[PDB]
Amino acid sequence: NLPKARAALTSARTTANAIYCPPKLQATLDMQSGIIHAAEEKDWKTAYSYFYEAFEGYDSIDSPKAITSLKYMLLCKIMLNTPEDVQALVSGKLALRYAGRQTEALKCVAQASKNRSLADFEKALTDYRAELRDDPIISTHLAKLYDNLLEQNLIRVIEPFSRVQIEHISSLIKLSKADVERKLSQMILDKKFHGILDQGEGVLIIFDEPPVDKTYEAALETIQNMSKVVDSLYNKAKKLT
Amino acid sequence: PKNPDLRIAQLRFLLSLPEHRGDAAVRDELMAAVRDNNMAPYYEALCKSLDWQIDVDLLNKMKKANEDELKRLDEELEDAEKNLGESEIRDAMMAKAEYLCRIGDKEGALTAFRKTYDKTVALGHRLDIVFYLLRIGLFYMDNDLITRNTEKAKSLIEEGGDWDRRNRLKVYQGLYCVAIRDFKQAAELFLDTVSTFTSYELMDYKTFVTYTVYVSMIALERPDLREKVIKGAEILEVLHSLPAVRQYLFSLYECRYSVFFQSLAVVEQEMKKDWLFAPHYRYYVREMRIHAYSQLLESYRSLTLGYMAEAFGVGVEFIDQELSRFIAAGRLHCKIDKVNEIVETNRPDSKNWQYQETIKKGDLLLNRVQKLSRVINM
Amino acid sequence: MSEKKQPVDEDNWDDDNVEDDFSNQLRAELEKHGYKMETS
Amino acid sequence: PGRIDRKIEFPPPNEEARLDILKIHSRKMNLTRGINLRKIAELMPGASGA
Numbered sequence: 088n089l090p091k092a093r094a095a096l097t098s099a100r101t102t103a104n105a106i107y108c109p110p111k112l113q114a115t116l117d118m119q120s121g122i123i124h125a126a127e128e129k130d131w132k133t134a135y136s137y138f139y140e141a142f143e144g145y146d147s148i149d150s151p152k153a154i155t156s157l158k159y160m161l162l163c164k165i166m167l168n169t170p171e172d173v174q175a176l177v178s179g180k181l182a183l184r185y186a187g188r189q190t191e192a193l194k195c196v197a198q199a200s201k202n203r204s205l206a207d208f209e210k211a212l213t214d215y216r217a218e219l220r221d222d223p224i225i226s227t228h229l230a231k232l233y234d235n236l237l238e239q240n241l242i243r244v245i246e247p248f249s250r251v252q253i254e255h256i257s258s259l260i261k262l263s264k265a266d267v268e269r270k271l272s273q274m275i276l277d278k279k280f281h282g283i284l285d286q287g288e289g290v291l292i293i294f295d296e297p298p299v300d301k302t303y304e305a306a307l308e309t310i311q312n313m314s315k316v317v318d319s320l321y322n323k324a325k326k327l328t
Numbered sequence: 329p330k331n332p333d334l335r336i337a338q339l340r341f342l343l344s345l346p347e348h349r350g351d352a353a354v355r356d357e358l359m360a361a362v363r364d365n366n367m368a369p370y371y372e373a374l375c376k377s378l379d380w381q382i383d384v385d386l387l388n389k390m391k392k393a394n395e396d397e398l399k400r401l402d403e404e405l406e407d408a409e410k411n412l413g414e415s416e417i418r419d420a421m422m423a424k425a426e427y428l429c430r431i432g433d434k435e436g437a438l439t440a441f442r443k444t445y446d447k448t449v450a451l452g453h454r455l456d457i458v459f460y461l462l463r464i465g466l467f468y469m470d471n472d473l474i475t476r477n478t479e480k481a482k483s484l485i486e487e488g489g490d491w492d493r494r495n496r497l498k499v500y501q502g503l504y505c506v507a508i509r510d511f512k513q514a515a516e517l518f519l520d521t522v523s524t525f526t527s528y529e530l531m532d533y534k535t536f537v538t539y540t541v542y543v544s545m546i547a548l549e550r551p552d553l554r555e556k557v558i559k560g561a562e563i564l565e566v567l568h569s570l571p572a573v574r575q576y577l578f579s580l581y582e583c584r585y586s587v588f589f590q591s592l593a594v595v596e597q598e599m600k601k602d603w604l605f606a607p608h609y610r611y612y613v614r615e616m617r618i619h620a621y622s623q624l625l626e627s628y629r630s631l632t633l634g635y636m637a638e639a640f641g642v643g644v645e646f647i648d649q650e651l652s653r654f655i656a657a658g659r660l661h662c663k664i665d666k667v668n669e670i671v672e673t674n675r676p677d678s679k680n681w682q683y684q685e686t687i688k689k690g691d692l693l694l695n696r697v698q699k700l701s702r703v704i705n706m
Numbered sequence: 707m708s709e710k711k712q713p714v715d716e717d718n719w720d721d722d723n724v725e726d727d728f729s730n731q732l733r734a735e736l737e738k739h740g741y742k743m744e745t746s
Numbered sequence: 747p748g749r750i751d752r753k754i755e756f757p758p759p760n761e762e763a764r765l766d767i768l769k770i771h772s773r774k775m776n777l778t779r780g781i782n783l784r785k786i787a788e789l790m791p792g793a794s795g796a
Binding site: 508509510589590593596597600607609610611613641642644646649650653657 | 716717718721724725727728731732733734735736739740742743746
């Protein structure tokens with residue numbers, strides 16, 4: 088229940104400064120802000136920073152609580168795939184302080200973030216399935232990943248040659264008409280992909296001529312030129328009568 | 329002191345289109361009659377709803393109690409003016425005299441408004457006038473006074489800033505933009521969102537979320553659409569509480585047309601049962617279609633209507649005349665072949681037509697400065 | 707003019723141009739498009 | 747020692763001093779109307795108008 092969790096988080100906002108010292112609240116409040124907002128899909132890198140700020144407050148607390156705490160933050164590095172904070176965290180003394188079993192399995196999970204590599208990703212997906220169960224939201228984490236990795240693999244095969252047949256290139260992605268080809272059509276709507284397909288002969292042809300410096304810089308000024316005359320129409324009509 | 333009577337305005341529209349319930353609308357109106365001392369709310373409803381039987385002395389002892397309350401406000405103006413003060417006497421009488429406008433007809437309206445409009449030294453008391461013309465302009469269908477009072481509120485109170493009652497104009501002018509047809513300024517003035525929070529004049533803010541989301545799916549473009557809801561914080565939690573509204577926004581980005589005939593019909597059901605949307609629900613239907621058809625045809629240069637029947641389930645003769653009456657009206661010009669199951673896009677509208685607006689406006693405009701040049705001499 | 711022959715002998719109205727096109731074509735329309743669900 | 751001219755003591759922050767100095771500097775900002783300027787001035791003993 089997300090609205091109930093926000094109401095529970097809202098009650099923690101006024102309770103943080105209510106008593107004298109939290110003693111630890113805002114550290115957990117920022118962690119709770121990195122959960123509900125993570126389900127709200129507000130922002131990734133900032134929510135990942137809340138797991139980093141909470142990890143700084145996790146120093147000298149119950150180890151069974153800190154051994155499952157790295158399950159959330161290191162899998163968050165898997166969701167983002169571009170946190171840019173990788174080298175900062177994992178190279179520090181605080182992230183490497185845990186030598187235990189489960190965290191060593193998370194050490195290669197944090198390495199799997201630097202891995203990507205679909206063929207490797209589909210493999211470690213089964214090896215890390217034990218850590219997949221502790222994922223708070225299993226759908227949102229791996230769906231955006233695999234959907235982002237889709238077009239990451241799509242831009243690789245379409246790049247070398249301009250036009251591509253859609254029957255052979257879809258055999259690598261295992262299907263054509265159901266979803267994939269509709270996802271490539273959505274990339275045209277998002278401008279990430281420039282090209283057009285052919286349903287009859289099954290060939291995707293990429294063609295682009297984006298720049299036009301003659302039409303755009305002209306018509307915009309002519310429309311502005313109308314505003315120059317319309318504003319002068321007040322001078323014209325008033326001086327005559 | 330609006331939402332109780334503002335719901336009576338919803339009761340007026342509740343009786344308008346459907347004839348089914350005349351009892352359900354008159355029971356909560358009598359419950360609104362026994363309080364607030366409403367006279368005109370049940371006077372004009374007496375013609376639309378049932379004529380009874382009898383109200384009369386049952387509600388006449390309330391207007392007699394109003395008469396005792398009206399005469400004590402009249403006794404308040406000459407008794408308090410015996411002393412001297414700034415706005416203390418005249419503001420105390422106008423707020424409750426504008427409440428006497430809530431009793432009935434135009435009597436309390438015109439006597440309170442124009443009398444106290446001169447002495448007011450604050451922009452807040454001048455807006456209470458404008459605020460109470462907008463509520464009676466909501467009750468009665470007259471569009472005259474609601475355009476005039478907002479014009480007076482924009483000159484005096486905007487000088488100048490304010491946090492609250494200036495943002496209410498963005499809601500009211502935004503409600504005027506949604507009352508008439510204005511797509512761009514409506515969603516633009518609705519960007520305040522939770523900054524206005526909830527007020528007696530703002531009713532339920534969740535209903536205001538439904539008002540700003542219906543104008544956002546048209547005027548706000550698809551790149552900007554997903555940009556506002558995703559990146560938005562306070563506007564995101566209010567749409568998440570509504571599963572039907574949130575599913576429509578995610579489906580609009582998902583482009584699946586199987587749920588559009590369902591979800592939009594549910595939205596159209598709300599469009600039918602809401603006031604001021606009666607003349608405007610006819611164009612809104614197909615406007616979201618071309619909004620979905622825009623990105624649709626952009627996918628493939630050659631498209632088959634058999635593939636359209638998949639998501640439409642099953643469009644065959646429906647989209648035939650549909651898309652035909654679109655291109656004929658100048659909405660999403662395209663070439664769709666019949667019995668050959670071929671759609672052609674194109675249309676390269678960034679080349680030929682973009683040069684035409686030059687001489688198009690350059691005809692009537694330049695003709696005006698022609699006659700204007702013939703004025704000299706004589 | 708006023709000379710010669712002729713002296714002897716947003717808005718919703720602006721939106722009515724598109725609205726009147728709906729009067730003679732496809733109504734508004736909701737109930738009909740709502741019936742298209744169960745038909746096919 | 748007030749010699750020779752009108753005697754003006756450099757004002758410390760005062761109740762009536764914090765009331766007018768706050769209302770003037772608040773004209774350049776957008777502030778809510780549900781705020782009480784009387785209590786906020788008394789909650790700041792000492793300090794200064796700056």
